[PDB]
Design a protein around this ligand. Structure first.
Ligand SMILES: Nc1ccn([C@H]2C[C@H](O)[C@@H](COP(=O)(O)O)O2)c(=O)n1
Length: 269
């Protein structure tokens, strides 16, 4: 049907973009000739997921062509990210990555093919594969949930840029509507989860972006006995007050580092 086509094209465009999201990261990694502190799990994952979904679609044949084309392109692009990463990786990390690549992507996937080609056909095949795709896709939500957890725990949104959230959300509702059009609730349900979590991400961003007060706008205070000036940007490290500390967040048993008088003797500049 026409609808499924519109949402297929849309889904492909948006998801294409999201597949090109790690590119600056890899421009970096190619610069430094090191994978730095980056992990290969998102990539090994994204590839395994893409493969599972291609496999799922080949069972649905005709309608689901559009959820192959994107996943197909996934397989390539992720395969690229994996190669580069393994090129510029630590020996230790190189081997970690290769091991997970052999377990999940080669063996795991092969076992899945083996179990599906010889234990199911037809509808039972659809249900098995679908169940597995839903399961894995859902499991991949651990990374964004982790990110959310960090954002709330840290009251910052540095690790969670707004546009990634937006694009993930739009991707989610697009493939949701897509699943609805081909009446496939294996494609649709985890996109419900995804759209929900994305919305919650945008909400968290709007809430926590300007939570902490910028060190710049923090107020200087002065000891009216010493003349001493407290710089929040400088803080008072030698006496257990890390730089960037606000004056009001300083423990009330703190004193003027020069004069030695109480905090009550201080007044804003
Ligand atoms: N519940 C899901 C999860 C994923 N995908 C497919 C659609 C996208 O083509 C790809 C997601 O790619 P990405 O988010 O990286 O852009 O996975 C899907 O059809 N249904």
């Amino acid at each position: 049907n026409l609808w499924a086509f519109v949402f297929g094209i849309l889904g492909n465009i948006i998801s294409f973009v999201l597949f090109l999201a790690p590119v600056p990261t890899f421009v970096r990694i190619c610069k430094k000739k090191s994978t730095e502190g980056f992990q290969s799990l998102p990539y090994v994952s994204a590839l395994f997921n893409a493969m599972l979904w291609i496999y799922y679609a080949m069972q649905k044949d005709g309608t689901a062509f559009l959820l192959i084309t994107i996943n197909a392109f996934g397989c390539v692009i992720e395969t690229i990210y994996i190669v580069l990463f393994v090129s510029y990786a630590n020996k230790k990390t190189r081997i970690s990555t290769l091991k997970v690549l052999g377990l999940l992507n080669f063996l795991g996937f092969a076992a899945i093919v083996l179990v599906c080609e010889l234990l199911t056909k037809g509808s039972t095949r659809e249900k098995v594969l679908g169940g597995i795709c839903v399961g894995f896709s859902v499991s991949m939500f651990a990374a964004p949930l982790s990110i959310m957890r960090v954002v709330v725990r840290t009251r910052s949104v540095e690790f969670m840029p707004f546009s990634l959230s937006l694009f993930l959300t739009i991707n989610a509702v697009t493939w949701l509507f897509y699943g609805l059009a081909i009446k496939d609730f294996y494609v649709a349900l985890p996109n419900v989860l995804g759209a929900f979590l994305g919305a919650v991400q945008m909400i968290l961003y709007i809430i926590f972006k300007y939570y902490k007060t910028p060190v710049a706008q923090m107020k200087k205070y002065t000891c009216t006995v010493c003349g001493y000036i407290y710089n929040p940007e400088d803080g008072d490290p030698d006496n257990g007050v890390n730089p960037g500390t606000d004056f009001k967040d300083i423990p009330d048993d703190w004193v003027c580092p020069l004069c030695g008088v109480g905090k009550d003797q201080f007044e804003e500049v």
